[PDB]
Design a protein around this ligand. Structure first.
Ligand code: HEM
Length: 185
């Protein structure tokens, strides 16, 4: 996992639960990096999992809800860091159907050691998209938050249903249905 994921995450923990919560979840976790992260550094996901598990226990907010809220904030980091990549797309369904073959392809060019999930499109219409999410990290709600802000980036919204193929969350079917949309875009 890239260090930008760690720094933006603990910045949000500081922003919502105070400084002491950042020191708390770090002390509760056995971290090889001792809780010190840089944007260019590469760290194991087992460190982030400990941070999420400890934050969930201290706040009584589920890991999925914590990952969702963080993902919705991280999309703004994506908007401000790579606007030219987002400017390639005019439609949220088209952009989401291009994560595997284009978006995260470009991410690998930037970070060759990036740990990315896989998305497989099974059905695709103008306002609907069914994709299979696969990742040993089971961060489906991180992807759900980025999907939410993808639709909001294009002045739209969508109903997104998650069906866990494997109950551990490492394989999730995403059923995406864009809403109306009362004015021509
Ligand atoms: C310009 C758009 C995007 C950029 C620059 C981007 C980049 C990244 C980066 C840097 C990571 C962290 C990799 C690591 O720490 O090793 C990541 C992970 C991830 N990305 Fe993207 N991403 C983009 C769009 C999306 C979208 C739209 C989705 C889902 C709809 C998505 C799904 C994910 C997920 C779920 C992860 C968590 C890793 C995992 O599940 O295994 N990404 N992405």
């Amino acid at each position: 996992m890239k260090g930008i994921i760690f720094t933006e995450f603990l910045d949000l923990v500081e922003d919502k639960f105070g400084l002491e919560m950042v020191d708390k979840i770090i002390t509760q976790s056995e971290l090889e990096s001792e809780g010190v992260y840089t944007s260019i550094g590469t760290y194991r996901f087992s460190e982030m999992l400990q941070l999420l598990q400890n934050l969930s226990a201290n706040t009584d907010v589920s890991i999925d809800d914590l990952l969702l809220t963080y993902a919705e904030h991280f999309f703004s980091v994506i908007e401000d860091s790579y606007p030219g990549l987002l400017a390639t797309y005019k439609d949220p369904i088209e952009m989401l159907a291009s994560i595997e073959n284009h978006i995260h392809v470009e991410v690998r060019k930037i970070y060759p050691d990036a740990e990315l999930p896989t998305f497989v499109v099974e059905e695709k219409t103008a306002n609907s998209l069914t994709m299979i999410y696969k990742s040993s990290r089971a961060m489906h709600h991180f992807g759900l938050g980025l999907m939410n802000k993808t639709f909001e980036h294009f002045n739209s919204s969508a109903e997104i249903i998650l069906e866990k193929i494997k109950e551990d969350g490492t394989e999730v079917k995403f059923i995406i249905n864009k809403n109306e949309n009362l004015y021509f875009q």
